[PDB]
């Protein structure tokens, strides 16, 4: 079926939970043996969210190459993404090592450091220009260059220096700051505006390594971001945009990382975002 009318048909019939459970039943199951080794317990935020072995990002280190991060490669859309958990106190250096090694231009953050009164990820970037951060375990230095605070999101320019080679690179930090503590946003308008700002920066384009996207677990809000982006790109590329099937795209993405889209409300919100976004691309 088309999307917008499949949408109204699920709303009128109140069957979002049944649709979402079908997706969960059909999703791929692949091994995640490296994630579950005992030496990696303090590298995982949640015991039930792990990268598959076949798609995990490897750190260029001979001691321990593990990080909770997955490469999502979308062949028809010609887009790639790295989805990862919010960094932990003992993985902030690994996080920036990955950004460096994979040649990423942008980092997309969809959570606040504290939500619901608890810490959802480490304070992994510097908050003042004159107070830089040094990660001694991976030999990297990170400096805040500028910050632009808007009503729904903040954009930061950062400098990452590889202290071994003295090479430097500019990284863009796109921080969506207004996702509610419970539920999903009422309108997709500010999320779409944010997606378009990431696109306009070059961070999603083939001349750079894959964008790094995270929330707390790296599957829920993060899944919504890449699902919406890929669906809108396919609608631009194809002769028949109504042929784009969001449930099929989500199942393809779940071949590369488990659990993408965590609730039926997040599924409905993804439909809403793609529907409204398709009108702005042209309406
Ligand atoms: N990209 C892409 C893509 C194309 C067709 C499909 O059924 C699912 C997909 F993710």
């Amino acid at each position: 079926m088309e999307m917008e009318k499949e949408f109204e048909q699920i709303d009128k019939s109140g069957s979002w939970a049944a649709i979402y459970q079908d997706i969960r039943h059909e999703a791929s199951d692949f091994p995640s043996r490296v994630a579950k080794l005992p030496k990696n317990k303090n590298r995982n935020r949640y015991r039930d969210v792990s990268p598959f072995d076949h798609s995990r990002i490897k750190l260029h280190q001979e001691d321990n190459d593990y990080i909770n991060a997955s490469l999502i490669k979308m062949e028809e859309a010609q887009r790639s993404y790295i989805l990862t958990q919010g960094p932990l106190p003992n993985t902030v250096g690994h996080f920036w090592e990955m950004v460096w090694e994979q040649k990423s231009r942008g980092v997309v953050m969809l959570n606040r450091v504290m939500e619901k009164g608890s810490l959802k990820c480490a304070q992994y970037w510097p908050q003042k220009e004159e107070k830089e951060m040094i990660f001694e375990d991976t030999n990297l230095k990170l400096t805040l260059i500028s910050e632009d605070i808007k009503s729904y999101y903040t954009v930061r320019q950062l400098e990452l220096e590889n202290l071994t080679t003295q090479e430097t690179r500019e990284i863009l930090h796109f921080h969506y700051t207004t996702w509610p503590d419970f539920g999903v946003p009422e309108s997709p308008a500010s999320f779409l505006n944010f997606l378009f700002k990431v696109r306009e920066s070059g961070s999603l384009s083939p001349e750079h390594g894959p964008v790094v996207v995270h929330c707390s677990a790296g599957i829920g809000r993060s899944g919504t971001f890449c699902l919406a982006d890929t669906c809108l790109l396919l609608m631009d590329k194809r002769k028949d945009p109504s042929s784009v099937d969001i449930k099929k795209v989500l199942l393809e993405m779940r071949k590369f990382r488990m659990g993408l889209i965590q609730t039926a409300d997040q599924l409905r919100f993804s439909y809403l975002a793609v529907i409204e976004g398709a009108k702005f691309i042209m309406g």
Side-chain angles (χ1 to χ4, degrees):
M1 196 184 316
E2 175 190 59
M3 190 171 30
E4 172 145 38
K5 290 185 284 155
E6 189 200 348
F7 179 85
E8 319 237 48
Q9 198 241 323
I10 302 169
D11 258 7
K12 74 170 170 50
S13 54
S15 50
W16 281 109
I19 302 300
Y20 178 66
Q21 260 304 140
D22 298 351
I23 287 163
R24 292 189 60 160
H25 180 70
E26 287 297 326
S28 305
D29 190 23
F30 291 112
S32 310
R33 286 166 210 131
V34 179
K36 304 308 281 171
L37 297 173
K39 66 175 175 162
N40 292 327
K41 196 157 180 179
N42 77 342
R43 291 182 183 216
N44 294 310
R45 184 175 287 284
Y46 302 105
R47 57 152 178 71
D48 60 334
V49 181
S50 304
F52 299 140
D53 294 320
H54 78 87
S55 53
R56 73 184 182 93
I57 300 294
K58 298 178 187 185
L59 307 171
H60 299 176
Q61 222 261 93
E62 41 193 31
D63 169 52
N64 189 342
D65 71 9
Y66 178 75
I67 181 170
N68 191 317
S70 311
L71 179 65
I72 301 8
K73 191 171 184 195
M74 303 306 292
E75 187 170 26
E76 186 187 350
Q78 285 294 291
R79 280 269 224 255
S80 292
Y81 319 84
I82 294 167
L83 269 63
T84 192
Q85 70 187 10
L88 291 155
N90 61 297
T91 69
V92 174
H94 307 149
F95 178 90
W96 286 114
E97 176 185 3
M98 175 175 69
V99 169
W100 184 268
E101 287 168 358
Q102 303 298 316
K103 302 179 157 55
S104 307
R105 180 84 190 293
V107 173
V108 174
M109 173 170 182
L110 304 171
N111 65 289
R112 292 168 301 280
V113 165
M114 179 166 282
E115 300 181 4
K116 296 180 184 182
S118 300
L119 294 173
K120 296 295 168 195
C121 91
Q123 182 60 52
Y124 67 86
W125 73 95
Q127 294 177 281
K128 294 179 183 303
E129 287 87 341
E130 68 277 13
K131 294 278 203 192
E132 75 273 18
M133 290 178 77
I134 294 174
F135 305 101
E136 296 185 342
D137 61 335
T138 56
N139 214 32
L140 291 159
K141 177 177 105 172
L142 183 67
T143 305
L144 176 68
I145 298 302
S146 76
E147 178 167 65
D148 190 355
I149 302 173
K150 306 276 224 301
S151 47
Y152 290 92
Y153 69 99
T154 297
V155 188
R156 308 179 178 93
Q157 300 183 304
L158 307 172
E159 183 202 67
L160 187 60
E161 181 182 348
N162 177 348
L163 292 173
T164 301
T165 67
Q166 292 194 328
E167 309 168 281
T168 64
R169 280 174 213 161
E170 181 185 327
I171 309 297
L172 301 181
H173 194 242
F174 285 94
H175 188 183
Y176 189 81
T177 55
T178 52
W179 195 295
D181 269 12
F182 290 94
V184 305
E186 184 160 298
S187 162
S190 59
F191 193 68
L192 286 165
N193 187 59
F194 174 76
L195 166 63
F196 299 156
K197 297 294 186 186
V198 179
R199 278 184 175 195
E200 289 175 6
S201 78
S203 291
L204 291 164
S205 300
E207 63 249 22
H208 301 293
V211 70
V212 172
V213 350
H214 78 89
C215 45
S216 193
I219 61 174
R221 300 171 200 179
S222 292
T224 301
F225 183 88
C226 59
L227 180 59
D229 182 53
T230 285
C231 283
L232 290 168
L233 212 51
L234 293 168
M235 289 176 78
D236 266 343
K237 216 171 201 254
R238 284 187 186 177
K239 290 184 181 184
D240 177 12
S242 75
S243 70
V244 173
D245 185 334
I246 178 168
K247 300 188 259 49
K248 287 175 178 168
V249 175
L250 178 54
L251 287 165
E252 177 67 22
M253 291 183 164
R254 277 193 178 217
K255 297 176 181 174
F256 299 92
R257 189 168 175 83
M258 64 172 67
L260 304 179
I261 308 300
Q262 283 178 295
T263 68
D265 258 35
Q266 280 178 3
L267 185 63
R268 181 180 186 274
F269 180 77
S270 301
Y271 274 74
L272 265 185
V274 175
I275 292 169
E276 186 59 26
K279 308 167 154 158
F280 199 73
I281 210 123
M282 315 183 171

